Amino acid sequence: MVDIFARLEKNAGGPIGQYMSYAHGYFAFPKLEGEIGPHMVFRGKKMLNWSLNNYLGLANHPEVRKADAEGAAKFGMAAPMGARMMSGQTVYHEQLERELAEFVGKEDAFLLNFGYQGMISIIDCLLTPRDVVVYDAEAHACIIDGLRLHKGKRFVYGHNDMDSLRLQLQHATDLAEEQKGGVLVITEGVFGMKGDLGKLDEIVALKKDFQFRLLVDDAHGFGTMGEGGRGTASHFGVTDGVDVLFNTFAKSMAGIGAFVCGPRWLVNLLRYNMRSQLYAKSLPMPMVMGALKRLELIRNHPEYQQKLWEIVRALQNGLKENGFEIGVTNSPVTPVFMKGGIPEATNLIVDLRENHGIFCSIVIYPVIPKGEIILRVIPTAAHTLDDVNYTIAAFKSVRDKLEGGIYAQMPIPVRADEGFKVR
Amino acid sequence: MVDIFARLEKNAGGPIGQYMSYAHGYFAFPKLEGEIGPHMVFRGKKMLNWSLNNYLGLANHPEVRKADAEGAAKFGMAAPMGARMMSGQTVYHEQLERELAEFVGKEDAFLLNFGYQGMISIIDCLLTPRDVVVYDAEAHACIIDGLRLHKGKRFVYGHNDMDSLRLQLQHATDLAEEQKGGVLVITEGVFGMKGDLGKLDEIVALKKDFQFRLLVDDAHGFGTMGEGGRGTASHFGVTDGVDVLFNTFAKSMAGIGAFVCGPRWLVNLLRYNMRSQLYAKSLPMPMVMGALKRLELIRNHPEYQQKLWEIVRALQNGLKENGFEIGVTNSPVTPVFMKGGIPEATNLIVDLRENHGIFCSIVIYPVIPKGEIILRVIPTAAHTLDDVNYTIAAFKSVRDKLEGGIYAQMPIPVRADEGFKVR
Ligand SMILES: *Cc1c(COP(=O)(O)O)cnc(C)c1O
Ligand SMILES: *Cc1c(COP(=O)(O)O)cnc(C)c1O
């Protein structure tokens, strides 16, 4: 008998504890200070960040800041007490659902209290052990966690690969008639890691051959792809091909909560069956009011999406002009691929921050093979072109030191929060 | 092959759709309007509700409403953009963690974005397929969903029964030595349905005969039980016996989010491993700010808890005086058990609302067996004794008509929202 605490204590605490030791406050859990935007303060110094997922610049929008301040003053954050079924239902929650459904072009929408929870329970509600899933290998964690709720069969197809898909689809369809069940395909509109867009058009094209249901997570696509920001589905003209459309307020909408879209009969079922919404609190009113304003601005200002993509093409082409390796990305997500070890990537970053005033996260060995280094650059419509130029310039300096072994000469910096204790 | 949409379109949509047709807006998704409190408006009429779980009356506390309004004005509702590990970490999140851990008397706390997914992931990283879980049969849905992620063995013990417990620990410990793993017990501090309390003091006494770890969901106990509202653990004086203490802001705290408490080494492990925290947005600042005020008020005002329990004892004893059945509740939860069918329960409630101005939910046949009718009465420190007397009076009238047979003479009322469409 290995006691649970004992195993987690040292046997599990030791390997990842080293990362915590030197990263807490700097490489993990940084503390950005100030109003939300490209220009914030880190550790006493003003900096230019590319780490926020706020694509449309709505976070510090004066109109958004008013609506947020006004809704909280009127309703407080106590807001609709209790779950939506029990006591937390308001006409404002229903107005936002009507406007969201109208925007993305489906019958109905259900305002969710949180994205991660919502996904877990849509996957829970759609699936029965008879049915069979086919999901993209790069699926977000909430999709994976929702899939672990399923006692049925699951088939994983290689990332955005229509050959493994069509292939695994045949295994699903074979198992589906044997088990007397249906088949469900889950992919994303915009994959946040590599930045590539889900090939939705080629996936609905496969609906001619295999007879399936399609679930799409457009968390990174809403406000950013398609007509006026309507998302990746609109971008491919497949809004009718996607049966269930999931979306979150975290990324473009600069906020909290989520919504799922589809036909009225199904959204109503989800209303009465989604455990994560039956048995947890309703989305607060201040968010509801603020989301109403945010959705108003996205509708009224299609310029925000344009300006974002102007920064996207400028940054992406500018980086590719100077031999920087941007991944296979058709979205604003701009990851910069490089080579090096932990002491190189760590020292690289403190050079970018303490010397060039550039703030970005890095993806390193715990996630990506040792030797790989990804700078995660996320352009927002709040960025300027001076921002783009300064960053590419500072990136160019930083690369010369990396390729010239200068960072390999230095040890891992010690920049963790003073006072942080691992035990 | 049964298409997933067809399995739910008419086959799964038919039975519960009738409930939706007549309940939506009245019995299913009521729209309480006004400031949060015992006296709000429903369908044009002012009413006295017992439906919100704001035990300490903090929701509309002026100091709380200022803190909420002030934090939103300063930070907006987007203020911690991105997940906590990436960009959403703030010193205010860490202040609230330090104050919460100090209150409930554990080493460390991790502020979560939402209780439901928080639980799903604390169960996630606590367990491996070798370990074995013993959980109370009445566990909340998020606990159930949480251990559906567990690919190992699970043993369910009968509600608050220390004999069916011991038998399953014996089965667990036996399987734990064969599988070379540990044991974990999950129960609740206050069970929200029947109102009865978890026998925590006894549960930790079983730690003499078996070596397990204990996880407790105090969602209904915080602010409500124990010294100054410290919760059910403090109420039994077994805070040291609870290894992992989960809690939510949705009930007494009158808000959004949650927190888990325990030793620093574990809370740090959870900080770096909880999927629902790594891969979802951080708790907004206005809530952080507000939660700091709410925790200040709880510490500074221990009569909020006493005023609550004065209303509890008055209401419960008054109902027991008049032969109403309150059940086995130890907590503020006051469920009133009665007998009847759906047309009786529904017309009972219409009478309570449209004639007596009393707002409460009912639990009906899909969940509890046909025959029982429980009114869910939730007392709150904002309730008056006049509130208690009027309700018991109205309850006494309503009961004479129920046992008399008047309600059985009427059909199921039609009171759903005009405009709601089932499909
Ligand atoms: C309220 C509730 C939760 C969830 O809290 P939320 O923050 O609303 O998700 C978890 N467990 C229990 C017992 C609850 O009553
Ligand atoms: C951020 C994210 C979510 C979750 O959004 P939250 O509201 O923060 O929980 C879900 N799916 C994807 C792809 C995401 O990037």
Author numbering:
A (entry chain A), B (entry chain B): 1 to 423
The authors write:
Sulfonolipids are unusual lipids found in the outer membranes of Gram-negative bacteria in the phylum Bacteroidetes. Here, we identify the first enzyme in sulfonolipid synthesis in Alistipes finegoldii as the product of the alfi_1224 gene, cysteate acyl-acyl carrier protein (ACP) transferase (SulA). We show SulA catalyzes the condensation of acyl-ACP and cysteate (3-sulfo-alanine) to form 3-ketocapnine. Taken together, these data identify the substrates, products, and mechanism of SulA, the PLP-dependent condensing enzyme that catalyzes the first step in sulfonolipid synthesis in a gut commensal bacterium.
The histidine tag is not visible but the rest of the polypeptide sequence starting with SulA Met1 through the carboxy terminal Arg423 are resolved. There were six molecules in the asymmetric unit with an average R.M.S.D. of 0.4 Å. The SulA protomer resembles an open fist with an extended thumb and contains three domains: an amino terminal domain extends from the ball to the top of the thumb (residues 1–60), a compact core domain represented by the bent fingers (residues 61–301), and a carboxy terminal domain that lies along the back of the hand (residues 302–423). PLP is bound to the central core domain that consists of a seven-stranded β-sheet with six parallel strands (β3, β4, β5, β6, β7, β8) and an antiparallel strand (β9) and is flanked by α-helices. PLP is coordinated by the main chain nitrogen atoms of Gly115 and Tyr116 from the amino terminus of α4, the side chain hydroxyl group of Thr248, and the main chain nitrogen atom of Lys281′ from the opposite protomer. The PLP ring is also coordinated by the side chain carboxyl of Asp217 interacting with the pyridoxal nitrogen atom and the imidazole group of His220 and the pyridoxal hydroxyl group. Dimerization establishes the active site by forming a surface to enclose the active site and creates a hydrophobic cleft that leads to Lys251 in each protomer.
